[PDB]
Amino acid sequence: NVFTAQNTAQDFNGNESTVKSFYVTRTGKKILVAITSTKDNLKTVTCLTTGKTVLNLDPPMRFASVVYLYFIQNISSLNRGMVIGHISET
């Protein structure tokens, strides 16, 4: 299943903004897989867990108001596909 909430991301300059965040559950753990935003220049996102983990974002997909989808760096194709399946319904 895919779980949705929000999280805070950063652009290159470090300016913060609130983004929608998409998680899957594997082996009990909640894995942040993707975020969406209207901003196209986000670089990392803060995941809250044992403090804050700061994760790198892949360059975004653009869906056209306009929504940018960023996958978290190195996340597996199967996990990416789960989120894509969930969002194609959203």
mmCIF file of C-alpha atoms in Angstrom:
data_model
loop_
_atom_site.group_PDB
_atom_site.id
_atom_site.type_symbol
_atom_site.label_atom_id
_atom_site.label_comp_id
_atom_site.label_asym_id
_atom_site.label_seq_id
_atom_site.Cartn_x
_atom_site.Cartn_y
_atom_site.Cartn_z
ATOM 1 C CA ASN A 1 0.000 0.000 0.000
ATOM 2 C CA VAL A 2 0.961 3.662 -0.427
ATOM 3 C CA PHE A 3 0.652 6.141 2.449
ATOM 4 C CA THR A 4 0.410 9.904 1.819
ATOM 5 C CA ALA A 5 1.225 12.856 4.102
ATOM 6 C CA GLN A 6 3.317 15.977 3.827
ATOM 7 C CA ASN A 7 6.992 16.838 4.446
ATOM 8 C CA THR A 8 9.386 19.752 4.056
ATOM 9 C CA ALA A 9 11.752 20.111 1.124
ATOM 10 C CA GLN A 10 14.578 22.412 0.127
ATOM 11 C CA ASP A 11 15.700 24.019 -3.150
ATOM 12 C CA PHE A 12 19.363 24.578 -3.897
ATOM 13 C CA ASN A 13 19.415 27.853 -1.966
ATOM 14 C CA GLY A 14 17.852 26.116 1.016
ATOM 15 C CA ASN A 15 14.442 27.762 0.840
ATOM 16 C CA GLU A 16 11.871 25.436 2.362
ATOM 17 C CA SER A 17 8.422 24.446 1.146
ATOM 18 C CA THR A 18 5.764 21.953 2.118
ATOM 19 C CA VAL A 19 5.346 19.011 -0.252
ATOM 20 C CA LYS A 20 3.103 15.949 -0.484
ATOM 21 C CA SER A 21 5.018 12.808 0.429
ATOM 22 C CA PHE A 22 4.447 9.186 -0.614
ATOM 23 C CA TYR A 23 5.586 6.211 1.482
ATOM 24 C CA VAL A 24 5.492 2.443 1.123
ATOM 25 C CA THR A 25 5.781 -0.149 3.883
ATOM 26 C CA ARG A 26 8.492 -2.804 3.573
ATOM 27 C CA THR A 27 9.516 -5.041 6.491
ATOM 28 C CA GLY A 28 7.591 -2.864 8.933
ATOM 29 C CA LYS A 29 9.593 0.230 7.981
ATOM 30 C CA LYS A 30 8.075 3.258 6.252
ATOM 31 C CA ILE A 31 10.113 4.209 3.180
ATOM 32 C CA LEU A 32 9.804 7.686 1.679
ATOM 33 C CA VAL A 33 9.618 7.010 -2.064
ATOM 34 C CA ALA A 34 8.492 10.239 -3.735
ATOM 35 C CA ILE A 35 7.242 13.773 -3.221
ATOM 36 C CA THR A 36 5.103 16.083 -5.344
ATOM 37 C CA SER A 37 5.234 19.837 -5.520
ATOM 38 C CA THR A 38 4.418 22.759 -7.760
ATOM 39 C CA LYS A 39 8.076 23.809 -7.463
ATOM 40 C CA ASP A 40 10.402 22.488 -10.146
ATOM 41 C CA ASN A 41 13.785 23.141 -8.484
ATOM 42 C CA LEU A 42 13.720 21.084 -5.283
ATOM 43 C CA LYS A 43 16.958 19.264 -4.350
ATOM 44 C CA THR A 44 16.397 17.354 -1.146
ATOM 45 C CA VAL A 45 13.619 16.491 1.299
ATOM 46 C CA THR A 46 13.615 16.025 5.066
ATOM 47 C CA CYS A 47 12.231 12.736 6.313
ATOM 48 C CA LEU A 48 11.277 12.647 10.034
ATOM 49 C CA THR A 49 12.098 9.472 11.971
ATOM 50 C CA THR A 50 16.094 9.273 15.450
ATOM 51 C CA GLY A 51 16.068 12.846 14.131
ATOM 52 C CA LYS A 52 15.774 14.232 10.599
ATOM 53 C CA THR A 53 17.097 12.336 7.616
ATOM 54 C CA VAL A 54 17.858 14.510 4.641
ATOM 55 C CA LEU A 55 17.382 12.685 1.344
ATOM 56 C CA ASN A 56 18.418 13.650 -2.199
ATOM 57 C CA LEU A 57 15.794 13.975 -4.929
ATOM 58 C CA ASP A 58 16.032 12.738 -8.554
ATOM 59 C CA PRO A 59 15.268 15.349 -11.246
ATOM 60 C CA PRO A 60 11.457 15.618 -11.387
ATOM 61 C CA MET A 61 8.840 14.340 -13.775
ATOM 62 C CA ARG A 62 6.467 17.069 -14.933
ATOM 63 C CA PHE A 63 2.715 16.518 -15.222
ATOM 64 C CA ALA A 64 0.583 19.280 -16.716
ATOM 65 C CA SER A 65 -1.851 23.257 -12.165
ATOM 66 C CA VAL A 66 1.494 21.685 -13.062
ATOM 67 C CA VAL A 67 2.742 18.988 -10.718
ATOM 68 C CA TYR A 68 6.373 17.873 -10.345
ATOM 69 C CA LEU A 69 7.023 14.344 -9.084
ATOM 70 C CA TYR A 70 10.445 13.646 -7.547
ATOM 71 C CA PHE A 71 11.634 10.185 -6.631
ATOM 72 C CA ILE A 72 14.033 9.868 -3.721
ATOM 73 C CA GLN A 73 17.556 8.920 -4.878
ATOM 74 C CA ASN A 74 18.284 5.156 -5.305
ATOM 75 C CA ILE A 75 14.757 3.937 -4.435
ATOM 76 C CA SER A 76 13.918 0.652 -6.221
ATOM 77 C CA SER A 77 11.815 0.386 -9.390
ATOM 78 C CA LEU A 78 9.132 -1.723 -7.666
ATOM 79 C CA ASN A 79 8.639 0.942 -4.973
ATOM 80 C CA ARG A 80 8.577 3.664 -7.610
ATOM 81 C CA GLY A 81 5.956 1.672 -9.511
ATOM 82 C CA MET A 82 3.738 1.372 -6.434
ATOM 83 C CA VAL A 83 3.671 5.149 -6.031
ATOM 84 C CA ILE A 84 3.064 5.671 -9.758
ATOM 85 C CA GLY A 85 0.132 3.257 -9.558
ATOM 86 C CA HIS A 86 -1.317 5.161 -6.598
ATOM 87 C CA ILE A 87 -0.920 8.550 -8.249
ATOM 88 C CA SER A 88 -2.501 7.460 -11.545
ATOM 89 C CA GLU A 89 -5.658 7.032 -9.459
ATOM 90 C CA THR A 90 -5.114 10.350 -7.694
#
